[PDB]
Each structure stands twice: as C-alpha cells, then as structure tokens.
Design a protein around this ligand. Structure first.
Ligand SMILES: *[C@@H]1O[C@H](CO)[C@@H](O[C@@H]2O[C@H](CO)[C@@H](O)[C@H](O)[C@H]2NC(C)=O)[C@H](O)[C@H]1NC(C)=O
Ligand SMILES: *[C@@H]1O[C@H](CO)[C@@H](O)[C@H](O)[C@H]1NC(C)=O
Ligand SMILES: *[C@@H]1O[C@H](CO)[C@@H](O)[C@H](O)[C@H]1NC(C)=O
Ligand SMILES: *[C@@H]1O[C@H](CO)[C@@H](O)[C@H](O)[C@H]1NC(C)=O
Lengths: 227, 106, 102, 46
C-alpha cells in the first residue's frame, strides 16, 4: 500500500498528446478491481485501472488511477487530490499535488576533431541551457525521420550554478563517424513552455561549421544596379 | 555542389559553403565559404534619393545579412523617386524611373 | 553573454569519474563548474559518460586562456588525463583573400 | 621520432611527476598545427 502521487511530464504532453493524473499505489493486497478515486476541485474522478497489475509473483499490486483527459486540463493547473478506499486500511490516504520564465537557449555544438581522428564514432550534443523549470522535451531529427529512443540518451536536467532559477540539460547523439561525414543535416528539435512555436529547430552538419579556408572575393565593379 | 546559404540582393552577398572531397584517408578535408560580394563603387548612400553624395564607407555585417538602407539596386524591384517639373508658374511632381529594365511596362 | 565549455568524457566502466577545471595552471573553485552524474551509453552498456560544464565570461574567453579540463579515473594509464583548448585551438584557418579592380 | 611521423601529426603528450603539482601530474600537447597562426594570402588581380 504505497502512498504516491505522480504527475505527468511536459515532455509527455507533446510526445503522446495525452495526460494522466494518477495516484500511484503499489504493493497493495491481492484484491482485484480496487476502488481508487483521484478527484480534483471540480469533482471528476479518474476511470478504473485497466491493463494493469492483478497478480504478480513479487506481490506488487500496482493500482494506478490512469485516465485519458485533455492535455490543456493540467495546463490550467487545477488542484488534484487522491482518495483511497481500501478494505485493509479503513483510513483513506490523502495527498494533493500542485504546480507553481526564461527563453530556452537550446544551442548546438559540433563534434570534436579528436572524434574524427580516432575514427571510432562521433558525438553531437544539444546544449539545452537557460530554461526553467526542468520540464523539457529533447528529440533528434535526421533524414526527416525521428530517431529511435535507443540511439540517443537525454540526461536529467540539473541546476545551473550561474542562474539558480534556470536549468540546463544535455543530450548526446552517438553515431558512426562515417555517417557524420556524409550530409544528414543532424537536425535538433526541442520543446519548452516559454517558447513561441513550442518548437525551436536547430541544425548542425558538415556543411556548416568552422571552415578551413576563407576566400572573400570582391570586384571593384563599375557596372552597378545589376545584382 | 555548393549550398547557397544566404543570397542578399542589396548587399549583393553570396553566402555559400563548399567542401573539397579528400582522398582515401582520415578526414582532414577542407571546408570553405565561397562568399563573393560585389560593390557598386558609384552608388549613393540613400539609394532612393538621387541627390545624395557618393558613399565611401560600405559596412558589410555578414551575420546581419543572414537574417538598414541597402547598397545596390535590384532589377526585380523598383527604386523610384519623385522629381518636380515646371512648364511655367505651376509646379508638378512626377514620379521618375531611376533605373531601366526594372520598372519597364511589362 | 558568456562562454560555456563542455567537457565530454566517455568510456569509464567503473562509473566513478572525477573532473576538475584548471585555469592558468591553477585549480578553480568548485562553484563555477558542475559535473553531471554518470549514466551508461546505449552503444556500450559497460561504459559510462559524464559531462562537466563551465560557464565563464565571453570577454575572458576572447583573451588567450587555457581553461584546462582534467579527468581522474582508475582505468587511465596515469590515472589523470588533462585536455586543453583555446580561442585558436582549432585548425589554422587558412585565408584565400582576393580583391579585384576590374 | 622519425621526420615523416611528425608530418602525420600525432599528439605526443608529455607528462611529469612531482609532489608540488596540485594534480601531481600535468600534460602538454605539441603538433604540426601548434604554430602557423592564421596565415593569409591576398591576390590583387586587375
Ligand atoms: C532616404 O531614405 C529614407 C529611409 O531611411 C527614405 O525617406 C522616406 O522614405 C519613405 C519610403 O520610401 C517615403 O514614403 C518618405 O516620403 C521618405 N521621406 C521623405 C522625407 O521624403 C527615402 O528613401 C530617402 N529620403 C528621401 C527624402 O528621398
Ligand atoms: C574559392 O576556392 C575554391 C577552391 O578552393 C574555388 O573553386 C572558388 O572558385 C573560390 N572562390 C572564388 C570566388 O574564386
Ligand atoms: C585559393 O587557393 C586555390 C587552391 O586551393 C587557388 O586555386 C585559388 O586561385 C586561390 N584563390 C585566389 C588566389 O583568389
Ligand atoms: C593562396 O593560397 C592557396 C593555398 O595554398 C594557394 O593554393 C593559392 O594559389 C594562393 N593564391 C595566391 C594568389 O597566392
């Protein structure tokens, strides 16, 4: 009988386009179809749990109050409460969750040259910094197709020493060094609250970067007005 | 084989980058920017106003032109002004065509 | 507004990495730089990666400064590996300037 | 080292062991590209 109330993440409200306001109760007694009420100030209760634990070898009966509601509902930030009606514990379990901006400086870095010299692999990170709070969605774009979650890893956000309010999150894209040599445009896509389009598109490739040679060519032309 | 990143017409800049393909070796191939910017060298500071003096200082902010009174005329657009005309006591203001082949009746 | 240098560390299997930042050959305060906790890469489950982030003023970065990043780990041959960058740490950036009076 | 090796530009790091070093060891790097600081060539064609 675990007392836990977890809210969804702002990365999930765009990745899945759905929200679930749940009372995470695990290690419950082996009683099927328990009555768990997760009601807000308005009074609506979540739907009964389906496709969830009913009998497990570890006896961790996970009774979760999952229900598909509007994504804008939790954006409005109504207060949600948990009410537990269980036969083993007559006393109900009560817990309440609630929610309390800077432009996300999502800026992109090229791979180091020593990665190229080693010829083992190449790494690209999107330095997602200067954003508050930690809720952020990081996704990778290449060849016009979303990369599988296996290939990339996004770290948990950490407090920034320079700005206590603003946080930073880093996510590396590890690819074969032969792949980066050919142009795949390695597009970086992010989502954050204090952002106009909800998407900022950043791009790094081999075409754009610090160049080895600069030929700036000017002609002291007299025939003007034709360019 | 070159990607034209930015082609601003008034500054007449051509921001384009090319990569020279190296031989069969570890990658040290040269990345270049093929920027080719052209000066009018005789246009005036206020491009719309014909009565301006010669401009000598041409300021080319390369980061700015990627994303300010502009330097050279564009044949696609019209840079036109109004000039007074007199037949006698009366004064009439008539729009003039500063450059040909741009505002020609088509 | 600032200059941020990312110290990318990959390949430590015991998952216990310690990173400092030294400027001008002297150690820096722990407040300025922050090091993330290790977590494994998907390519190599055995290996782990961690990042050290230092934020410094851009004007100080314009002046030639070392900002050496050093990583301490058991599996290193000397147990300490130090890497450095600079404003001109990259390729010499050959020019090919052309001016025409035609 | 051989002359041809230096043209290939391996790192050749140098380490020193000492008590007075706060890290007890420090590293330096020298390559073929450690010099040649921004060499330019300008063509004036008529
Ligand atoms: C000098 O450039 C300025 C722009 O900085 C222009 O002045 C105005 O331009 C608008 C748009 O063409 C006109 O509607 C106004 O009538 C102009 N102002 C005046 C006082 O005429 C213009 O291109 C140049 N100014 C002049 C006087 O030619
Ligand atoms: C710049 O250099 C490349 C070769 O490196 C050459 O093909 C190109 O024409 C040069 N640019 C100009 C404007 O001449
Ligand atoms: C730049 O160097 C190339 C050789 O890589 C040469 O062909 C070209 O003429 C040079 N550009 C000049 C002289 O403007
Ligand atoms: C400029 O430098 C390049 C690089 O070596 C060279 O190939 C080119 O011919 C040079 N041009 C002139 C005019 O010196």
């Amino acid at each position: 009988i675990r007392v836990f109330a977890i809210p969804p993440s702002f990365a999930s409200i765009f990745l899945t386009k759905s929200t679930k306001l749940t009372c995470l109760v695990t290690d419950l007694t082996t009683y099927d179809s328990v009555t768990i009420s997760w009601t807000r100030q308005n009074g609506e209760a979540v739907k009964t749990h389906t496709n969830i634990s009913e009998s497990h070898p570890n006896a961790t009966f996970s009774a979760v109050g999952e229900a598909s509601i509007c994504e804008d509902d939790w954006n409005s930030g109504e207060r949600f409460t948990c009410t537990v009606t269980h036969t083993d514990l007559p006393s109900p379990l009560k817990q309440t969750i609630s929610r309390p901006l800077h432009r996300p400086d999502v800026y992109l870095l090229p791979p180091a040259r020593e990665q190229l010299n080693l010829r083992e692999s190449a790494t690209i990170t999107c330095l997602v910094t200067g954003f508050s709070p930690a809720d952020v969605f990081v996704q990778w774009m290449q060849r016009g197709q979303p990369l599988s979650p296996e290939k990339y890893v996004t770290s948990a956000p950490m407090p920034e020493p320079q700005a206590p309010g603003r946080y930073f999150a880093h996510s590396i894209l590890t690819v074969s060094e032969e792949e980066w040599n050919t142009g795949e445009t390695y597009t970086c896509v992010v989502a954050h609250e204090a952002l106009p389009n909800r998407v900022t598109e950043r791009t790094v490739d081999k075409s754009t970067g610090k160049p080895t040679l600069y030929n700036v060519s000017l002609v002291m032309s007299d025939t003007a007005g034709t360019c | 084989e070159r990607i034209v990143l930015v082609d601003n017409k008034c500054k007449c800049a051509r921001i384009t980058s090319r990569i020279i393909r190296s031989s069969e070796d570890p990658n040290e191939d040269i990345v270049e920017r093929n920027i080719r910017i052209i000066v009018p060298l005789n246009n005036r500071e206020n491009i719309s106003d014909p009565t301006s003096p010669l401009r000598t200082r041409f300021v080319y902010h390369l980061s700015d032109l990627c994303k300010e009174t502009c330097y050279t005329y564009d044949r696609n657009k019209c840079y036109t002004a109004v000039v007074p005309l007199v037949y006698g006591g009366e004064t009439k203001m008539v729009e003039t065509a500063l450059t040909p082949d741009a505002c020609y009746p088509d």
